[PDB]
Amino acid sequence: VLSEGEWQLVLHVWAKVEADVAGHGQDILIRLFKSHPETLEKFDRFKHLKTEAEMKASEDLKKHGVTVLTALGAILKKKGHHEAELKPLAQSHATKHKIPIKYLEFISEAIIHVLHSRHPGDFGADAQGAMNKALELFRKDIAAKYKELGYQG
Numbered sequence: 538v539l540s541e542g543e544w545q546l547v548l549h550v551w552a553k554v555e556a557d558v559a560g561h562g563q564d565i566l567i568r569l570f571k572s573h574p575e576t577l578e579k580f581d582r583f584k585h586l587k588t589e590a591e592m593k594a595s596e597d598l599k600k601h602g603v604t605v606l607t608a609l610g611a612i613l614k615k616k617g618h619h620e621a622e623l624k625p626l627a628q629s630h631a632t633k634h635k636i637p638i639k640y641l642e643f644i645s646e647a648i649i650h651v652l653h654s655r656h657p658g659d660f661g662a663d664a665q666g667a668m669n670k671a672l673e674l675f676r677k678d679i680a681a682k683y684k685e686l687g688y689q690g
């Protein structure tokens with residue numbers, strides 16, 4: 538359970554993201570795909586992209602980055618009271634998209650890196666720890682839904 542002070546640190550940096558949701562989503566997906574190429578393989582939509590320049594030039598990738606970060610922002614702004622938002626996401630990622638929990642760890646690392654690059658003055662260690670806790674809570678709660686459905690592994 539995050540404290541109120543931890544949530545404030547999380548949402549204070551997240552308010553900085555929402556000024557350029559699409560730029561952040563591009564940086565985060567690109568980092569994810571470069572760092573963990575098995576992730577790119579889960580998107581039939583993106584698997585033709587073979588270079589970082591092609592990734593940066595894809596408008597469809599930029600659109601998906603906004604989809605991802607819009608859903609994550611709505612979950613973070615619930616400060617843990619996020620059951621209604623996670624249900625459908627856990628269900629589609631477990632049963633349709635077939636995304637292992639481990640890849641949610643990977644995208645959490647990319648999010649943290651990109652926030653540190655773009656917002657260092659609002660993403661010192663206290664805020665990095667709080668955002669780590671928030672993303673761990675996200676993963677923990679998705680993992681319990683996966684386990685229900687037979688996908689925790």
Ligand code: HEM
Nearest residue numbers: 576579580582604605608609625626629634636640641644
């Ligand atoms: C912060 C974590 C993530 C969030 C908030 C998120 C959110 C979403 C949303 C809102 C959609 C569209 C609606 C739906 O299908 O449920 C989507 C689709 C999808 N996601 Fe995620 N996602 C996350 C992580 C991942 C990761 C790590 C992968 C793969 C490695 C992934 C793979 C996919 C795929 C394959 C689709 C369908 C894309 C398409 O072909 O249109 N997601 N995601």
